Structure 1
Amino acid sequence: VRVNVLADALKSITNAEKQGKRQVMIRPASKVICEFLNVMMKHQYITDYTVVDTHRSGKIVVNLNGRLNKCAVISPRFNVTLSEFDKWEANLLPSRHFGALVLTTSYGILDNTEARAKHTGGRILGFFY
C-alpha cells in the first residue's frame, strides 16, 4: 500500500528526468509534496508546477528543465539536531556548493541553508542535486 506519498512523487520525478521527459504527473497531491516542490523551485531545479483539483486529493504536473539530477526522499525522518547538519550533508550531498537537503521544521519546510540561518532543526525529508 502507499505508505509514503512523497517517496512515490520523488521517484516519479527522478525517473522522468533520466528519460529526458519534459513534464511529469503525480497522482496524489499533498501539502508536503507542494512544499518540497517549492523548495526545488527557489533553487531553479524545476520550472514550475500546476495542481489540478479532482475532488479526490488531486494531481500535480511538474515541468522539468534538464537540471534535476536526482531528487530522493529519506526514509524514517530522523530528528536532525542543528549539530548534526554537516554530518548529513557530508553523507547525502555531492559537495559543499551543489546540493541541498530538505527539512520539516516548526517554521515550515526549509532546506539546510536557511534552516541553519533560522537556527532550527527538525525531521529530514529528502534532498536534490
Structure 2
Amino acid sequence: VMTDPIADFLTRIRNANMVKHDKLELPASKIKKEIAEILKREGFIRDVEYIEDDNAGTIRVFLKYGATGERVITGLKRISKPGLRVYAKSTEVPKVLNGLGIAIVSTSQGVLTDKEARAKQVGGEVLAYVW
C-alpha cells in the first residue's frame, strides 16, 4: 500500500526528467504544497498550479529545461524514510553539493531550505536533497 506519499512526489519528478516530459500532475497534499512551492523559488521547476477537485485536489508541476534541452534537476533523494526518521540539530544541517544544491528541512518555524535554517539557528527533519 501507500506508505510514503512524499517519496512519490520525489520519484515522479525523477521519472519525468528521464523522458524529458514537460509537465506532470499528482494528488495534492498540504506538505507537498511547500515542497513544490519551494522548488519554484530556486528555479528548479518552471511553474506550479493547483486544481481543486472533490477528493483532495490536484497539483501539476511544469518541469524546466535549459536551452538545448539540459536538465535543471539532476537528482532527488529522500532521507528521512518512515523506516528510519532522521533529525538534524542547528549545526548539523548539511550542504548538498557544496552549496550548489538545497535540502528541504521541516523546522518548527515551517518547511524551509537548509540555507534559511542556518540563518535562524533551528533544526528539524531533513526531507529531501535536490541538486
TM bucket by the smaller chain? 0.7 to 0.9
The C-alpha deviation readout for 1:56-100, integer Å capped at 9, x for no partner, is 1122110011211122322144111112123xx3xxx3x313101
Higher helix residue share: 1
Deviation at 1:114, TM superposition (A): 0.3
- 1:69 pairs with 2:69: no
State the partner residue of 1:53.
52
Report how many aligned residue pairs link the two structures.
122
Q: Which runs of 5+ in 1 are unaligned?
A: none
TM-score scaled to structure 2, two decimals? 0.86
Percent identity at matched positions?
A: 28
Q: Which runs of 5+ in 2 are unaligned?
A: 66-71
Q: For 1:98 and 1:40, locate their aligned partners in 2 and report how far apart those are by CA, in whole Å.
A: 14
The answer on 1:35 being equivalent to 2:50 is no
Q: Are the equivalent residues in 1 in contact too, given 2:37–2:48 (CA < 8 A)?
A: no
> What is the rounded CA distance, in whole Å, between the counterparts of 2:116 and 2:8 in structure 1?
26
SS in 2 for 1:83: coil
Whether the aligned pair in 2 keeps the contact of 1:77 and 1:125 (CA below 8 Å) is no
Give the structure-1-normalised TM-score: 0.87
Equivalent residue runs for 1:1-129 within 5 Å: 1-26=1-26, 28-66=27-65, 67-74=72-79, 75=81, 76-86=84-94, 89=95, 93=96, 95-129=97-131
**Secondary structure of residue in 1 paired with 2:91:** helix
CA RMSD of aligned residues (A): 1.3
Q: What amino acid maps onto 1:62 in structure 2? A: V
